[PDB]
Design a protein around this ligand. Sequence first.
Ligand SMILES: [Cl-]
Ligand SMILES: [Cl-]
Ligand SMILES: [Cl-]
Ligand SMILES: [Cl-]
Ligand code: NA
Ligand code: NA
Ligand SMILES: [Zn+2]
Ligand SMILES: [Zn+2]
Ligand SMILES: [Zn+2]
Ligand SMILES: [Zn+2]
Ligand SMILES: [Zn+2]
Ligand SMILES: [Zn+2]
Ligand SMILES: [Zn+2]
Ligand SMILES: [Zn+2]
Ligand SMILES: [Zn+2]
Ligand SMILES: [Zn+2]
Ligand SMILES: [Zn+2]
Ligand SMILES: [Zn+2]
Ligand SMILES: [Zn+2]
Ligand SMILES: [Zn+2]
Ligand SMILES: [Zn+2]
Ligand SMILES: [Zn+2]
Ligand SMILES: [Zn+2]
Ligand SMILES: [Zn+2]
Lengths: 122, 118
Amino acid sequence: TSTMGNLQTAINDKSGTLASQNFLDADEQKRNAYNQAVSAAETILNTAKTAVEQALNNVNNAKHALNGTQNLNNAKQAAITAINGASDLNQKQKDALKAQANGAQRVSNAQDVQHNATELNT
Amino acid sequence: TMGNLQTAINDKSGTLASQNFLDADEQKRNAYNQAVSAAETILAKTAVEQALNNVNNAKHALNGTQNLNNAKQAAITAINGASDLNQKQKDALKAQANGAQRVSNAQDVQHNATELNT
Ligand SMILES: [Cl-]
Ligand SMILES: [Cl-]
Ligand SMILES: [Cl-]
Ligand SMILES: [Cl-]
Ligand code: NA
Ligand code: NA
Ligand SMILES: [Zn+2]
Ligand SMILES: [Zn+2]
Ligand SMILES: [Zn+2]
Ligand SMILES: [Zn+2]
Ligand SMILES: [Zn+2]
Ligand SMILES: [Zn+2]
Ligand SMILES: [Zn+2]
Ligand SMILES: [Zn+2]
Ligand SMILES: [Zn+2]
Ligand SMILES: [Zn+2]
Ligand SMILES: [Zn+2]
Ligand SMILES: [Zn+2]
Ligand SMILES: [Zn+2]
Ligand SMILES: [Zn+2]
Ligand SMILES: [Zn+2]
Ligand SMILES: [Zn+2]
Ligand SMILES: [Zn+2]
Ligand SMILES: [Zn+2]
C-alpha cells in the first residue's frame, strides 16, 4: 500500500538515524523506544492497514521524541553556568573552558568540560 | 545562545548526507546551505538568535522524505494504470517502488513500468 511505502521510507532511515548525535545522546528510554518501533515495523515489512498505520505512527513518534540535540544544549549550558560560578578561575581560563563547552559535539564532551572546570576551580 | 548556534552548525555534515536533504527541492537545499554559512560567519544576541532560527527553520523545511513518498506514490499510480501489465509484473514493479531509497529510484521504476506497458 501507500501506507507500506511510507513505512518503508521510515525503516530505511534507521541506519542514518542511529548514527546521528540526536539519537546517540537521546535518553536511553527514548533510544529504546525508537529501536523497538523500527524492529516492529521491520517485522511487518516481512498487514491490515491499521497495523501498518500504527507501526508507522510508532516509528514517527519515537523518532520525533529523540532528544540528543536538546540534551547537548542542556549540557553545554550546565557547563557554562559552572564555569561562570567558578570564582577562583581567571578570565583566560573561563574563556578557554567556555570555548570547549560551546564547541562540544557530544553530551560527554560538555560534561567533561564541566568536571574539568570544577576540578581546576578547587 | 552561541552554544546553541554551534550545535546547529556542527550538524551540517550529517544533515548534508541525509536523504531528507539530498532529495529536498533545490531551493530548500540552498536555503539550508545559506543559513549554515551565515551562522558559520557569526561563529549582537538578536543576530545570533536570528541566525539560529534561520538554520532551524531551513532544516525543518527540507523535504526529501516527503519527495520520496510522493515519488513512490506516483510510481504506484502509474503501475496501477498500466493496463497491459499482468499481476506478476505489477507486483514486482510495486515492490521496487515501495523499496526505493532515493527519489531517482522511484522515478526509474515509474519510467520502467510505462516503458514496459507500451
Ligand atoms: Cl543529529
Ligand atoms: Cl533522512
Ligand atoms: Cl530511504
Ligand atoms: Cl518517466
Ligand atoms: Na526530537
Ligand atoms: Na522537513
Ligand atoms: Zn541531526
Ligand atoms: Zn519530527
Ligand atoms: Zn576559593
Ligand atoms: Zn568523559
Ligand atoms: Zn565532576
Ligand atoms: Zn577529576
Ligand atoms: Zn580531585
Ligand atoms: Zn546530525
Ligand atoms: Zn536519513
Ligand atoms: Zn532522515
Ligand atoms: Zn516541491
Ligand atoms: Zn531573542
Ligand atoms: Zn524541526
Ligand atoms: Zn509491499
Ligand atoms: Zn533515472
Ligand atoms: Zn520517463
Ligand atoms: Zn526507456
Ligand atoms: Zn520506448
